[PDB]
Amino acid sequence: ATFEIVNRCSYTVWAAASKGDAALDAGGRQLNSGESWTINVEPGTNGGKIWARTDCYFDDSGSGICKTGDCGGLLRCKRFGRPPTTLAEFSLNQYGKDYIDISNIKGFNVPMNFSPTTRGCRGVRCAADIVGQCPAKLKAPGGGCNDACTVFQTSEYCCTTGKCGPTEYSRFFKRLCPDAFSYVLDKPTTVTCPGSSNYRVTFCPTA
């Protein structure tokens, strides 16, 4: 499928696309305010993720660091990024259809809109100012708003026993962004799209 990753934020971010054990397309790229990055994610891609990284510093070899969403210090990500990271999640060509969602399970760093550029389904969005409203204990010193699992490492927040319920912290993310997963067992906000649909991920959609 084809994804256009657009940065509408007034400042540069560093986009990243990965399925965990490898990079999607180039994997990562610098995106200045207003720039667009088109990529082709191989069909059949399961567990793909697209996100933004903030305050990055890379040398000529694509090696460095970012304050949010850093992926092993590489410009071109081969792995998922370090929280907090608003996540555009998706799986393509699964039993004839695709499904997408936005997740705050790994925290929030930048507002986002994840929508299809073809027909057959609607998009999802989480454009509230979660960083600005972030509770003191979840505020990431490097910028962003950490999820409770990242901050406290408990079975409840991380839902490690496969059994957990909503929490005061997950409720913060759910209240500001109803259409995004607030915790692991959150009521699905997944959207089912026709197989092989195309999409556009927009950072700071309401800017």
What does the model show?
- The protein has 207 residues and is mainly β.
- It has a single domain (1-207), classed as Thaumatin (Sandwich).
- It has four helices and 13 strands.
- It has helices spanning 130-133, 148-152, 155-158, 168-176, and strands at 2-7, 13-18, 23-31, 36-40, 48-58, 64-68, 87-94, 97-103, 112-116, 124-126, 180-181, 191-194, 199-203.
- The strands form two sheets. Strands 2, 3, 5, 6, 7, 8, 11 and 12 form an eight-stranded mixed β-sheet that branches. A five-stranded mixed β-sheet has the order 4-1-13-9-10, with no helix packed on it.
- Strand 7 (87-94) and strand 8 (97-103) form a beta hairpin.
CATH architecture label name: Sandwich
Specify the structural class.
mainly beta
Q: Which sheet architecture does the biggest sheet show?
A: 8 strands, mixed
Cα-atom radius of gyration: 16 Å
Classified in CATH, the superfamily is Thaumatin
Distance between the termini: 27 Å
Described by the principal axes of the CA atoms, the overall outline is globular
What name does CATH use for the topology? Thaumatin
Protein name: Thaumatin I
Keywords: Cytoplasmic vesicle, Disulfide bond, Signal, Taste-modifying protein
Subcellular location: Cytoplasmic vesicle
Family: Belongs to the thaumatin family.
